[PDB]
Amino acid sequence: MDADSLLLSLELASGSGQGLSPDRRASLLTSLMLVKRDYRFARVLFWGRILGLVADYYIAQGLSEDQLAPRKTLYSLNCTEWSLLPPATEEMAMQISVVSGRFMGDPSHEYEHQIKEETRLVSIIDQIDKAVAIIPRGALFKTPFGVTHVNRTFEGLPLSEVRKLSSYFHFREADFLDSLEYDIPRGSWSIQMERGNALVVLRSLLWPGLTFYHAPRTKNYGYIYVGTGEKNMDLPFML
């Protein structure tokens, strides 16, 4: 989510209940502004949290012009001390498949199944972005120059279009993006209305902790993954 989600508690307004304290919120505002300074990103959205057993990894994601670029991930344990997380590949996706369990706060932790916790952080954040990173329909407009920009004239979805999974897009490489109605399982997405139905909350069931914010009246949107960081393989049993 953008900085507008850190001037007000947009995260906890979704009713998921997990988010940032005002301490972390103000610290994150200053730190993500400094990240946009130090790293010349077009925008610096707060990706979310990986709730560990010792400390939580506060995650930020760099956005280029060129928003479907291979987005650059950053991590921080004490919020402000932001550090450039390495990018993800297919080998590191295959590497962590033998490991299961909750994240440890120290990213130097080792698993004997060695495997670094930093590699787990990189791979799990990549998997969450490829699976359940949400963009509402029409928020991004494929520019004729081979580059994706913000559709800066985007009006929020009509309330008729709110209830359809077709009106929401996977924020990744592929109206250009893939819609959520093919995201198997068919019931894998939960759509609910809060705050007088001026608020659409769309939570991932396959990756619990994701909660996508959207205000239909305006263009205020964003997604945050605040959760344990594992994939709910039990989803078809649970549906």
């Binding site: 033998v98 198997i184 393989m233 549906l239």
Partner: protein
């Protein structure tokens, strides 16, 4: 010895229809052939067991029924005085099997109904034991995979009424490996 009422020939021992009681206390009602048992009839044991069906030499064969002392019961095909071929067995707690038989044992294809829970095990049987590929039907889940030692073993597979599968693997006793992705078929 016991006693009986029925018909016979001059030389033949018994070949008509009637009732016979034995020294051991059990009784019979029905058909019989020369010094032996043949055709439709009815057993009645002292222990509470029964049978209704056909015989050939002195053995249960063809269509028939059986009531056991413990309350379990069976009908279907018999052979060589043993359960054989297609048949249906009912156990003391309303669970039932229906399927093939081979020498008093579950063998080949057959369906076992878990009447306690409503689920069904459907697939191969080997000597009374749930082994081989089989399809375990729950209310909305349907597990496809191999069984061994009355337990799922091997790769795959679940099918769901929600419109997706879930591939996996069984390694230890009732333990599921790291589950693979969902399929669309």
């Amino acid at each position: 010895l016991g006693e009986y009422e029925g018909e016979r020939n001059e030389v033949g021992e018994r070949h008509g229809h009637g009732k016979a009681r034995l020294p051991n206390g059990d009784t019979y009602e029905g058909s019989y052939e020369f010094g032996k048992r043949h055709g439709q009839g009815t057993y009645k044991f002292k222990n509470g067991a029964r049978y209704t069906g056909d015989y050939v030499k002195n053995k249960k064969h063809g269509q028939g029924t059986f009531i056991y002392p413990d309350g379990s019961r069976y009908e279907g095909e018999w052979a060589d005085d043993q359960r054989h071929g297609q048949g249906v067995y009912y156990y003391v707690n309303n669970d039932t099997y229906t399927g093939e038989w081979f020498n008093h044992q579950r063998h080949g294809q057959g369906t076992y109904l878990y009447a306690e829970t409503g689920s069904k095990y459907v697939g191969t049987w080997v000597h009374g034991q749930q082994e081989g590929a089989a399809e375990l039907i729950h209310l909305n889940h349907r597990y496809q995979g191999k069984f061994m030692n009355k337990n799922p073993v091997g790769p795959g597979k679940y099918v769901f009424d929600i419109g997706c599968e879930q591939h996996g693997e069984y390694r230890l006793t009732d333990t599921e490996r790291g589950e693979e992705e969902e399929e669309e078929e």
